[PDB]
Amino acid sequence: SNVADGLAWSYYFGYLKFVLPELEKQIEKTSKFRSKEKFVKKMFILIPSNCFWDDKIPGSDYDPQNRITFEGNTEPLEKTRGGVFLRHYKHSVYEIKDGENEPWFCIMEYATPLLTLYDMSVAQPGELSREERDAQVVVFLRKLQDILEGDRACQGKYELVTFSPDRDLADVMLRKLKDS
Amino acid sequence: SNVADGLAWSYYFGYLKFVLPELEKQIEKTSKFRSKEKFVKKMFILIPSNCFWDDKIPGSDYDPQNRITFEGNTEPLEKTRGGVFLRHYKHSVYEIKDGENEPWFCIMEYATPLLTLYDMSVAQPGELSREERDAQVVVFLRKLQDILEGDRACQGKYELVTFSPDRDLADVMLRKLKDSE
Numbered sequence: 001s002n003v004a005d006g007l008a009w010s011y012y013f014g015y016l017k018f019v020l021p022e023l024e025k026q027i028e029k030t031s032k033f034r035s036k037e038k039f040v041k042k043m044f045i046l047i048p049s050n051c052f053w054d055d056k057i058p059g060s061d062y063d064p065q066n067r068i069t070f071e072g073n074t075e076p077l078e079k080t081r082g083g084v085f086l087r088h089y090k091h092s093v094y095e096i097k098d099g100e101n102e103p104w105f106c107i108m109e110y111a112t113p114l115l116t117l118y119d120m121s122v123a124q125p126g127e128l129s130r131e132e133r134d135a136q137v138v139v140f141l142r143k144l145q146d147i148l149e150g151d152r153a154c155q156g157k158y159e160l161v162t163f164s165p166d167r168d169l170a171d172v173m174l175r176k177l178k179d180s
Numbered sequence: 181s182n183v184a185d186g187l188a189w190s191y192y193f194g195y196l197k198f199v200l201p202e203l204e205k206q207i208e209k210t211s212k213f214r215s216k217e218k219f220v221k222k223m224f225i226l227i228p229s230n231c232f233w234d235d236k237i238p239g240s241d242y243d244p245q246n247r248i249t250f251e252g253n254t255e256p257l258e259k260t261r262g263g264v265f266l267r268h269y270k271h272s273v274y275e276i277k278d279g280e281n282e283p284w285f286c287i288m289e290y291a292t293p294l295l296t297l298y299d300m301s302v303a304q305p306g307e308l309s310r311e312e313r314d315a316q317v318v319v320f321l322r323k324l325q326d327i328l329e330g331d332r333a334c335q336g337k338y339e340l341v342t343f344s345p346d347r348d349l350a351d352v353m354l355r356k357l358k359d360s361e
């Protein structure tokens with residue numbers, strides 16, 4: 001009865017499989033990013049425990065100190081899924097202040113299928129309670145990890161960032177960025 | 181433990197919930213569509229048994245008689261999911277020849293999460309065999325109906341079209357189109 005299992009597979013085959021092994025090559029297409037130092041070429045997938053987000057990350061409730069700042073989008077990646085439709089995959093680059101030091105540059109994204117988990121818990125409580133939802137998050141997380149790590153082309157090109165709605169996303173990002 | 185179960189929920193909350201109760205109102209935004217007769221304002225969701233499609237529907241392997249023809253896109257519906265990003269939901273209108281009679285007009289779409297089922301069966305056979313895939317289709321289908329039918333705003337605004345890769349999608353569409361109220 002685990003909805004998260006099918007949510008992870010879709011995320012991979014319907015998105016990450018295309019965009020993760022070409023991300024680094026796509027970022028370097030722009031001189032500004034090619035020159036930039038302190039730039040991690042890995043996609044940071046934000047996974048809030050409450051599966052919720054309602055606004056842009058700069059000056060967000062997750063960024064009280066106003067450290068995160070939108071810098072711009074990457075080069076669009078042309079791809080067709082099923083041959084039925086042609087899309088342009090692009091990502092957002094954010095600038096994270098590191099105090100007096102040169103600010104960091106990274107690619108952050110939310111796990112869009114997590115909204116489906118939240119939406120369920122609010123629209124159909126008889127199918128998913130706040131407790132089950134919290135469990136499905138863990139399920140989604142671990143299952144996603146397995147899928148990704150089972151792909152050589154995607155290994156080392158991503159990072160799963162799990163945090164609580166109280167934690168400072170800026171303080172969490174840096175702790176990861178340096179360890180990268 | 182059904183991958184199809186989670187595939188249906190995402191389809192609804194991440195798409196159909198937004199686009200289905202506003203589809204008819206969106207179609208009438210174009211004069212050409214307001215005038216057009218023999219036009220069903222319901223979204224026809226194509227569900228091939230093999231979870232596969234590789235090209236445009238006009239002149240496709242599902243349309244040997246070459247009756248289906250792209251007519252144009254509907255008016256885009258601006259909507260935000262999570263408020264983080266703004267998208268434009270639009271759909272494709274197709275013209276289905278009905279012999280000597282006036283051709284039909286409808287909105288057909290594929291169930292994009294079905295590709296994930298196919299992709300699995302080819303990339304990870306040890307997780308989904310060709311047989312399980314066929315079973316997950318039924319699961320996805322039956323579950324999807326329930327979710328939709330459980331929403332009053334979406335009722336009567338959709339239709340599930342199930343067919344085999346051998347059947348003529350044009351011959352299948354009409355059989356549904358005519359039977360539609």
Ligand SMILES: Nc1ncnc2c1ncn2[C@@H]1O[C@@H]2COP(=O)(O)O[C@H]3[C@@H](O)[C@H](n4cnc5c(N)ncnc54)O[C@@H]3COP(=O)(O)O[C@H]2[C@H]1O
Nearest residue numbers: 014085086087088089090112194265266267268269270292
């Ligand atoms: N489920 C989702 N989660 C997170 N972000 C999403 C999203 N769906 C769309 N977006 C973002 O919104 C952009 C424009 O969406 P739009 O729906 O108006 O126009 C879309 C849409 O009509 C179609 N498209 C995108 N994803 C699709 C999908 N999974 N299935 C079917 N059509 C899709 O391709 C067009 C352009 O795609 P493009 O990626 O270059 O650009 C997309 C993408 O960046």
Ligand SMILES: Nc1ncnc2c1ncn2[C@@H]1O[C@@H]2COP(=O)(O)O[C@H]3[C@@H](O)[C@H](n4cnc5c(N)ncnc54)O[C@@H]3COP(=O)(O)O[C@H]2[C@H]1O
Nearest residue numbers: 010011014015087112113116190191194195267292293296
């Ligand atoms: N262009 C893009 N940019 C960013 N992320 C992308 C993306 N295309 C796909 N994804 C990711 O993969 C999932 C879509 O899986 P799938 O496309 O097979 O199945 C999708 C698709 O069938 C439908 N859907 C979502 N957005 C759509 C759109 N703009 N147009 C048409 N269908 C859409 O809803 C299903 C679940 O989508 P969900 O949003 O919950 O979650 C998305 C999203 O997490």
